[PDB]
Amino acid sequence: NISVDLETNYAELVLDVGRVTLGENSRKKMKDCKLRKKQNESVSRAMCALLNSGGGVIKAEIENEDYSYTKDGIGLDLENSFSNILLFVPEYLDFMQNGNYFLIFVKSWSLNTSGLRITTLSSNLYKRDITSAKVMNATAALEFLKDMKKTRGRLYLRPELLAKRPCVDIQEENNMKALAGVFFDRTELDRKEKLTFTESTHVEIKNFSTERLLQRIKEILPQYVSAFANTDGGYLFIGLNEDKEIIGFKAEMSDLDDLEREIEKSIRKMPVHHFCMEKKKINYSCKFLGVYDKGSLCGYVCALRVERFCCAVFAKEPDSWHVKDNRVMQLTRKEWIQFMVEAEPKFSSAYEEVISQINTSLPAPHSWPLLEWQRQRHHCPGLSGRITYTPENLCRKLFLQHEGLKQLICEEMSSVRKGSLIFSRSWSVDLGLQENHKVLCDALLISQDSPPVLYTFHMVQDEEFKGYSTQTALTLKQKLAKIGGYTKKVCVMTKIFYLSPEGMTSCQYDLRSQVIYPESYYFTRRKYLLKALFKALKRLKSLRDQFSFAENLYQIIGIDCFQKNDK
Amino acid sequence: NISVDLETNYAELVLDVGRVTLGENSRKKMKDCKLRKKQNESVSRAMCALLNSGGGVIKAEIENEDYSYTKDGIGLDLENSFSNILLFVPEYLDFMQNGNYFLIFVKSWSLNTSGLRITTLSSNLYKRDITSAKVMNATAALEFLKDMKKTRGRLYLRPELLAKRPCVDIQEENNMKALAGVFFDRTELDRKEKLTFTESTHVEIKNFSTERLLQRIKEILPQYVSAFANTDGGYLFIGLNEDKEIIGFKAEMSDLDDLEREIEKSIRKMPVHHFCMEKKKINYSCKFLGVYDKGSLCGYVCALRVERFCCAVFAKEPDSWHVKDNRVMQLTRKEWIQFMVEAEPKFSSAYEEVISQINTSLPAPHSWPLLEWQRQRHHCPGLSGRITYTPENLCRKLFLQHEGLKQLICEEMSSVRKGSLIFSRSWSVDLGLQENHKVLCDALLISQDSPPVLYTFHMVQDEEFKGYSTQTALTLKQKLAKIGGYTKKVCVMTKIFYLSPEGMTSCQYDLRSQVIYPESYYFTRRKYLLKALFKALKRLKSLRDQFSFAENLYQIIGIDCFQKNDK
Amino acid sequence: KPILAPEPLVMDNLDSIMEQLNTWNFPIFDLVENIGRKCGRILSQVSYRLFEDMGLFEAFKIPIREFMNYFHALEIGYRDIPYHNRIHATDVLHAVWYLTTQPIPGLSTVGYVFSKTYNVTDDKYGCLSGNIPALELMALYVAAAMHDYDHPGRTNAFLVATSAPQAVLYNDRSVLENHHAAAAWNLFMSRPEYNFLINLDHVEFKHFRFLVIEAILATDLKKHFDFVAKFNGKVNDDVGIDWTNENDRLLVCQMCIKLADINGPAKCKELHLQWTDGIVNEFYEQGDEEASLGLPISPFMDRSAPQLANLQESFISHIVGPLCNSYDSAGLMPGKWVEKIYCQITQHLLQNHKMWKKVIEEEQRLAGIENQ
Amino acid sequence: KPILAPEPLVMDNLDSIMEQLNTWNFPIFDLVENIGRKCGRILSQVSYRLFEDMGLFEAFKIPIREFMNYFHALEIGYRDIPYHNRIHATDVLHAVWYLTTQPIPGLSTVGYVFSKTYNVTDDKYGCLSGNIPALELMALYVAAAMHDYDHPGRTNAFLVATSAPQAVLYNDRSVLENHHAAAAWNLFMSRPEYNFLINLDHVEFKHFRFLVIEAILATDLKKHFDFVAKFNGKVNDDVGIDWTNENDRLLVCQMCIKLADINGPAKCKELHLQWTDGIVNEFYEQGDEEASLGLPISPFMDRSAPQLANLQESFISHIVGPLCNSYDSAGLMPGKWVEKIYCQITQHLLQNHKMWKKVIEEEQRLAGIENQ
Ligand SMILES: [C][C]N([C][C])C1=[C][C]=C(C2=N[N]C(=O)[C][C]2[C])[C]=C1N([O])=O
Ligand SMILES: [C][C]N([C][C])C1=[C][C]=C(C2=N[N]C(=O)[C][C]2[C])[C]=C1N([O])=O
Ligand SMILES: [Mg+2]
Ligand SMILES: [Mg+2]
Ligand SMILES: [Mg+2]
Ligand SMILES: [Mg+2]
Ligand SMILES: [Zn+2]
Ligand SMILES: [Zn+2]
């Protein structure tokens, strides 16, 4: 299937979708449609999962031998699936061939004007247009479900009265729904007679020149029961032809009871969801009519009647995915709609607003940012004031002891125009994770260019700590988007330093010269990463001392705490 | 073309789209594609215009002789066009055949979760997917334009630095954009040689085995200049084939001059729109390369280079319509963008909120509505307290004089379970219209069922006033949706009464038994029509005395006025 | 010298009537004449029971001698006027003890104190005293005892328009509610024998004094629709009442005391009728002083052309009506299941509203037949 | 008996110095010693010029005898303290006359009064006095004269924590700003010879008194980020400043006086340095009275361990910085075109901010070398 590749030195979720052919001309002349469909759906499930849980990278072994991607492209059946999930492809996907692999670097799905919170391969909520049943796309299923939730159900207008209208010969869609209502109650049908009505938003007609007809109803029926139930209800007549000449199918007795069992079987398997107090079921009724030619039974005709529902009705579960811990799963029907119906909190108190309102950055200086303040303005003796050592008390005690640490930190921040590193006794518990005690401390350098680095210091000559730092860089990358709201592309690099007494050297690991990324991942914004880092720490309830904004002045003027439900 | 039918007794905008064939089997076997396309586009322009300006009805003369609609349906090309403009068709369209005409009753487009304010047949803003140029749909062009407006332009990342990445043989999309960058500057092309690159999001390749090639470039080029300019820019090479074997076209000199003139002609005709300070132009550059076989010139190859833009670039004007006064027009490019970029005001002061939050109406009585109050609780001697004669001072003075008026108004409200009629010296000036002085007064009955009626009283035995009352009923139906926010279907009926001295009779006109509507237009909600009527009058600044909520109690408490920028 | 206390702290003549105190239609006017009305010590006596009932005399170690010393000094400050006197303060104290310590059908309970009786056996019957710590409720009970203290007898609009010294002092912004909280707190810190809050911290007494002031200021009616709009914005679209939040627990006590302040037309027809003659008897006094100055007499404040029914029908539909709808859509009104939910408080509001619509109908119809 | 006036109304010794009054760096401290500082009549003298300049003495028919009678009684109420005295009131009066009657590059003008000089010739140079009627500006000028009246010398946090009688009176909510507006308005209505607003209606004097109180209460710093957040929400996403709206014209005068109240670190380095020794000289006094009671001395209010530079660098980056960014992103700061736009006020803020960062660097670096 699709397994989380845990044998890679990327600080990201890597999915191994198996082997995949590639190229426009290679996918075209591929003489196996059932394979080419299964490969396309496997790269679409992976791309949907990574969009919903942070970001990641999809790794697919090239199947055809001589693939180049610089004279072969990707393919056309793949490009369509990419472009149906994402409005703008270049804002989310980057393609790169790395030797014997094809990699796709997926950004994280971010809240936009459309109001969607998660991506879906298919809602599987069908609707009924004038004559055809189609599937609700993402923005239709969002607006169909937000109304049902609002009115705690669905408002139908059961026949309290026939409207007193003038008397004039007029033809409407109730004329077809009326004629079919009497065709339904007909006890017998003459073979090769004429229909007084055609198909509309309340009537469907199926020919189905099939010998089995049961392996066909098994897969085409639940999308028509869903169409009718989701809009106004209707009828479905099986056993006609295209010329509106009633024929029926050559069905012997002892098979209609199986059919009625299969029909009632498939219809009781369809998922549903109620926004109302009671919990009804999909009301309906089947029926079989004879098509006696003149005195002999020529066949049969199955008439199905689906009444309008009160809430949603799925043809299958919502086809939306996500990766939970490993082994990417499918969003259950209770979680899927909870993304499509509910909002985010969005507190953003009045003090918090001006902490981020500085970030307008029109074409002008617009100085005085509040997320880059500090009382102590003297570290790194040979320098100007361009790095903010943030906690200012953990960054002081850590420098008193560990005599090699301070000179290593200053020798490291030499090549940075302007940044801010944020120490911590452990950056793993700050992100809601398990802590290991062999790690001395941590840091997080957020500079202008050179994407965020995560220094992991420690003084133990036994381990390597590649698993601690890499897993913490991964978790920090997903919270910066899924929680902090950062809407661009990020990668979190990593450095591991050994810090035995009497010496500050032996960089045990440097992840930057170990993994290659696309071009756009190496440039950040550094004012939206501080904003994003602020909100992620706040949502995790780990905001203690980063982002100083010292409150000796606030206390003189009685201004209150930053933000919480604690005063 | 499409003309506003001003010879109908409907209180609505009627468009006469001309003659139109109808039926599934009739449209299918129609042996004129250019006609069937022109008829479909004419019913789509009309349906888009009515969605944007209130509602209306489209009237189309049946072209085929024998048509039924109860055994012939509508079509399939028509049904698709309806379903592309509207998410849910049955919430907006009602179909009805009335003798020798086919009528479509269009609801008014209303603000929904999608955030769209107007409907569009085509944005004509193309974008570039991985290999193909496609058109931005409604929700893509909304999110593409709202970002450009937010940043006052478009943020590009011009090569301030090449990212310091590891040294590993890696293939990316810049490899194709780089190879094409050197194919572009090539001075000569060997005939039938290979390309080192394929087409991607920066490169397009066109065969164009055409004799003219100029009537073809005229209509396919501006959608590729728009694709590239709207995303990252790219190259376009004309004169190759599908096997990547450079061929060129057999073009003689002095035609490349005309071509370069036509290319620069069509590209300077494309519309644009800037959200930035400066107003640049579409930067680009054309070029022609020889395809000398070995020592002879075999043809030519046109290379086009489009650089990334700072703002939007249209292939044509936005294909969105609206009916201004009559003779439905097309929304200009400045009006179209102001709908897709800006919001509505939405003031809704604290007092105004509780006037509307009463309307939650859960499955419980939930009494005490504030839009149905009145001091005087005694009119219509034989009755209970179920009608609110709203102005309460215009309703009193009008009843003192006009001795026949009071008994007529009470004999008229006999058959109403619960409603509220709102008098006025003239309901035309209240809706921002021209007044005529021959009309004594007006009224507006808003009952539970029986959609809103507009009584027009007058005592002059010379006129008929069918044009005054009908035009005022029309303007009231559009303001209720476009301004009041009423999100269901409405028709405004009309009655005209003669009120000579000594007599209350002679109903000159009764529009209810003159026009037939669909079934759903005869049932209103009456709590959202008062809410809708409240906001329409407020936006028009005509809210004076309707909706009493007397302020003798408010003055004792000290509470202020209802709402305005007047205190 | 100062007002200290009556010699026997807790009297017992008024027994067998404090027992029927767990009922919404508490016969307040019968407990008045029961007590010697010459002096007036109802507020200190009704307060000792409701505090003994809840169990706050032990959870905070409140010395009873200093407690009764204060509340007796409190009631002497309440002037002798028709409506805003020491009886109205006891009715608003009882009404908040009821609303917070009675079974609410469908309330999810979570330092707390429950009522003495409460008959706690169900899981669908929660009470507000189990969703709010005892500190926030003792503040809400002390904020209700002193919320009309030293009332001049006039309304805010009168003090503002006539430029009274209390209006120039508080800048025409809650001229009365600022006065009740200031003049009552200023009397508390005056003497040392009033400090019944002696066994409290410094951070508690700061949070206590904050909640007491924020409740006495929510009983202003000029800010009525601001609260009712805010409360519906947190029960309609939000996640509901978040009983772990401290701003949400505050907004629920600011509505609980707002509703208890105006609770006249939600009691029996005999009780609601007595109060209504009280308030208009206060208005007519203001019309007297308002006509002896040259100012046009206010609406409803003319004892020669009274409109007692017009006033009460505008009040119930405009002010008290939409307030109980908000307090009921949030699922906080105490009622009882129907084997669907019965509400005694909302029923008196509906009955009393219809009672005044008859009086207005028969008064316009009758008046119309006379004047032709 | 009452303070009435000095005998010669408008003195003239202080001429040739009121002429250089249309400049942002008005030499206020030289006009002080110029006037006989034994008594102090600067506020009444600087007020008569700015009112004569605007032309409000005729647009409202303000009797000059009663005008000077009031403002002289006003300045005598301003206590004799280091910072919040009658000189600070003249600086905040002048700063609002400047901000509202000087050319703003790119302002779309629409009863109005423009400054006496104004040299009105351009169409890109609008002034705020042409977007706000004269009534809203005379309220904004009288609200600035009396906005620190009768200042006790302590801050709100001190009055609240020590339970001062002014804090129990106003319920710990804007204890000082409520006092300045009340004690100043109460002195106005005291005598009849102060009523210089005699030729006004009843509805004008009600709207005038409302705007005056709503401006004196916006100079509270505890509500700083509430205003700055509200002002950016109406210039960032809204339709801009809607000069036909009356709530938007109010919010622009509530920022204009907020910025003029804290305008020290936006003048020349000599002027800003004199004020800064003023304010900390006030803080040290509060630390004295705060240590003689047992309370821990507040930050920055310890005259033995002064941190004058730490305080001024936190103030400019936290309070005055983000306020001028908001008042500048809305395109209201008076400046000049560069043949792109020059801002004298914003430049002094940048220069002065860098001046204190040197003093902090050389004080930490030097201190670090001593303590190893
Ligand atoms: C001015 C006070 N007023 C508001 C309009 C008022 C009127 C009537 C009653 C009132 N009416 N009916 C009763 O039964 C007793 C009280 C609640 C109370 C108030 N009030 O705010 O206190
Ligand atoms: C408590 C008053 N305080 C706020 C922190 C304050 C400090 C400093 C100055 C100040 N600093 N520097 C100067 O040049 C003069 C004034 C504006 C003014 C105030 N204030 O609010 O009035
Ligand atoms: Mg009160
Ligand atoms: Mg009260
Ligand atoms: Mg002050
Ligand atoms: Mg000041
Ligand atoms: Zn249901
Ligand atoms: Zn541009």
Author numbering:
A (entry chain D), B (entry chain B): 2 to 568
C (entry chain A), D (entry chain C): 669 to 778, 800 to 1028, 1070 to 1102
Source paper text:
PDE3A is a phosphodiesterase that catalyzes the hydrolysis of cyclic adenosine monophosphate (cAMP) or cyclic guanosine monophosphate (cGMP). A structurally diverse group of chemicals, including 17-β-estradiol (E2), anagrelide, nauclefine, and DNMDP, induces apoptosis by forming complexes with phosphodiesterase 3A (PDE3A) and Schlafen 12 protein (SLFN12). The PDE3A-SLFN12 complexes exhibit a butterfly-like shape, forming a heterotetramer with these small molecules, which are packed in a shallow pocket in the catalytic domain of PDE3A.
In 2016, de Waal and their colleagues found that a synthetic chemical 6-(4-(diethylamino)-3-nitrophenyl)-5-methyl-4,5-dihydropyridazin-3(2H)-one, DNMDP, can induce cell death mediated by PDE3A and SLFN1217. One of the most interesting features of the PDE3A-SLFN12 complex-dependent apoptosis is that the pathway can be dose-dependently triggered by many structurally diverse compounds (e.g., anagrelide, DNMDP, and nauclefine) and cause cell death in HeLa cells. SLFN12’s helix is positioned at the mouth of the PDE3A enzymatic pocket, and the side chains of its L554, I557, and I558 residues comprise a highly hydrophobic moiety for interactions with the hydrophobic phenyl ring of anagrelide, together with the L910, I951, I968, F972, L1000, and F1004 residues of PDE3A. These hydrophobic interactions between these three molecules (anagrelide, DNMDP, and nauclefine) and SLFN12 “glue” the PDE3A and SLFN12 together.
